[PDB]
C-alpha cells in the first residue's frame, strides 16, 4: 500500500493549501497514561475541495513549498 | 602486598587457630591463644553486629592470606557466578594455587606454600606457575619442580600433611611429589566453623 495519515482540516484559508491536524495516542514515558498528541501538517489541496472540520487522508510527497511536503488523497468525511 | 607481621596475634584476635604455624607444636604452648593481643586484650568487649561480620571476613582473609582488594574481587566474582555466593567464595579461595599446594602437603603453611609458588618450585600441568592467586581447574596436576624435589622443607611438610586430615577432592602422591585437583571442594568438605553468610551480608552493607 502507500503510507497515509487521516486527520481533521483545521484551516482552509490558504489557496490550494490546508492545515490538517493528526491525532496520535501515545503512552506517557514515565507516567504510563495514554495521552492524545497533535501534529499539524500543511497539505496541498489542488482543487480547494477540503473545508474546515473535514476528515481527510493525506500522503507524503516531494516538497511543494517551504512548509508543505504532504498532499490530499481523499476527503473521508465532510464537515 | 603481604602481611609480614606476627602470625599468632592474628589468631589471638580471631580467637581460633588460623593454622599460621606448622602445627608441630600446639598453639597454646606457643602463645596465649585465648587472649586477644595487646594491653587490653584480656578484657573482652561486647561485639556489635558489624563487629561480628567484620571479624568473620578478617578470619577468612587471614587464613588464606588475601588482602582486601583481592578478597573484594573474589566476593564480586562469587556473586556473579551462579549458585550460592558464600559457597562460591570459599570455592574460589580453595582454588588458589597457594592453598592447593598447602593442602597437597607440599607446604607446611600457606605462607610456606606461597614462597614455593613464588620461587618457581611449582608446576601446573607441567608448566611453571609462580602466581599465588592462580586458580586451579578440576583435573589439573600440581607438581614440585625436579630441582625443588630435594628441598628438606617439602619432605617435612608432607609428613605434617599426613598428621592433618586429608582433602577428599585432592589426590596426592608422595615421593613423586605430584597431586591432582580432582574436583572443586564442596561446602561440606570445608570447615563448618566459617560462617560465609556474614561475609556476604557484610559486602551488602
Amino acid at each position: 500500500k502507500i503510507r497515509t495519515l487521516q486527520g481533521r482540516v483545521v484551516s482552509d484559508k490558504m489557496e490550494k493549501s490546508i492545515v490538517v491536524a493528526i491525532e496520535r495516542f501515545v503512552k506517557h514515558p514515565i507516567y504510563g497514561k495514554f495521552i492524545k498528541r497533535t501534529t499539524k501538517l500543511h497539505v496541498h489541496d489542488e482543487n480547494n475541495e477540503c473545508g474546515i472540520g473535514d476528515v481527510v487522508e493525506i500522503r507524503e510527497c516531494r516538497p511543494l513549498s517551504k512548509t508543505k511536503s504532504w498532499t490530499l488523497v481523499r476527503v473521508v468525511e465532510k464537515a | 602486598a603481604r602481611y609480614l607481621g606476627p602470625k599468632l596475634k592474628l589468631s589471638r584476635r580471631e580467637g581460633t587457630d588460623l593454622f599460621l604455624k606448622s602445627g608441630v607444636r600446639a598453639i597454646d604452648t606457643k602463645c596465649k591463644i585465648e587472649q586477644a593481643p595487646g594491653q587490653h586484650g584480656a578484657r573482652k568487649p561486647r561485639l556489635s553486629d558489624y563487629g561480628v561480620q567484620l571479624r568473620e571476613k578478617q578470619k577468612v582473609r587471614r587464613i588464606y592470606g588475601v588482602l582486601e582488594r583481592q578478597f573484594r574481587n573474589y566476593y564480586k566474582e562469587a556473586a556473579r557466578l551462579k549458585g550460592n555466593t558464600g559457597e562460591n567464595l570459599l570455592a574460589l579461595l580453595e582454588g588458589r594455587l597457594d592453598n592447593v599446594v598447602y593442602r597437597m602437603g607440599f607446604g607446611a603453611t600457606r605462607a610456606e606454600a606461597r614462597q614455593l609458588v613464588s620461587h618457581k618450585a611449582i608446576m601446573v600441568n607441567g608448566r611453571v606457575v609462580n602466581i599465588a592467586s592462580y586458580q586451579v581447574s578440576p583435573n589439573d596436576v600440581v607438581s614440585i619442580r625436579e630441582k625443588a624435589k630435594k628441598q628438606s622443607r617439602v619432605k617435612a611438610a608432607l609428613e605434617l600433611a599426613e598428621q592433618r586430615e586429608k582433602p577428599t577432592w585432592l589426590e596426592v602422591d608422595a615421593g613423586k611429589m605430584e597431586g591432582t585437583f580432582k574436583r572443586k571442594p564442596e561446602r561440606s568438605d570445608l570447615s563448618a566453623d566459617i560462617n560465609e553468610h556474614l561475609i556476604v551480608e557484610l559486602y551488602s552493607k
Binding site: 506517557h28 514515565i30 507516567y31 504510563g32 497514561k33 495521552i35 | -
Partner: protein
C-alpha cells in the same frame, strides 16, 4: 498528586547549592592572605581561633581557618585553601592546606602528620 497533574507539571528536583562556592568545583584554590587574625568562636565554645582573610585567584575573598598548633602566615602570604567549614566560626567555610606553598607544616607533630604537612621524622 494525580498522573494527569504530573503530566501537566512533573515532579521538580531541589537546587542543591554548594557550601564551598569560592572553590568553584575545584579541590583547592590558591589565595593571598589580606589579613591574618584571631576570632572568638560562637557559644558554647571559648578560644582564640586562628583565621586568615584570603583573596583567591578567582577573585573571591573568603575567610580560611588555619589548623594545627602555631603558624607562620602573615599578610601577603600565598596559601592553598581546601573545603571544610569550621562549625563554631560563622562565615568560615574553608581550611588552609598546611605544608603547601608559603604555609608551613605544624612543628613537632607526630600523629596525623599528613593532615598538617609534617614530614616523617
Amino acid at each position: 498528586a494525580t498522573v494527569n497533574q504530573l503530566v501537566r507539571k512533573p515532579r521538580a528536583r531541589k537546587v542543591a547549592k554548594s557550601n564551598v562556592p569560592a572553590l568553584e568545583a575545584c579541590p583547592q584554590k590558591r589565595g593571598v592572605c589580606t589579613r591574618v587574625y584571631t576570632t572568638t568562636p560562637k557559644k558554647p565554645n571559648s578560644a582564640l581561633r586562628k583565621v586568615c582573610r584570603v583573596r583567591l585567584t578567582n577573585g573571591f575573598e573568603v575567610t580560611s581557618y588555619i589548623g594545627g598548633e602555631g603558624h607562620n602566615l602573615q599578610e601577603h602570604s600565598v596559601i592553598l585553601i581546601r573545603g571544610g567549614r569550621v562549625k563554631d566560626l560563622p562565615g568560615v567555610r574553608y581550611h588552609t592546606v598546611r605544608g603547601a606553598l608559603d604555609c608551613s607544616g605544624v612543628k613537632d607533630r607526630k600523629q596525623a602528620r599528613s593532615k598538617y604537612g609534617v614530614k616523617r621524622p
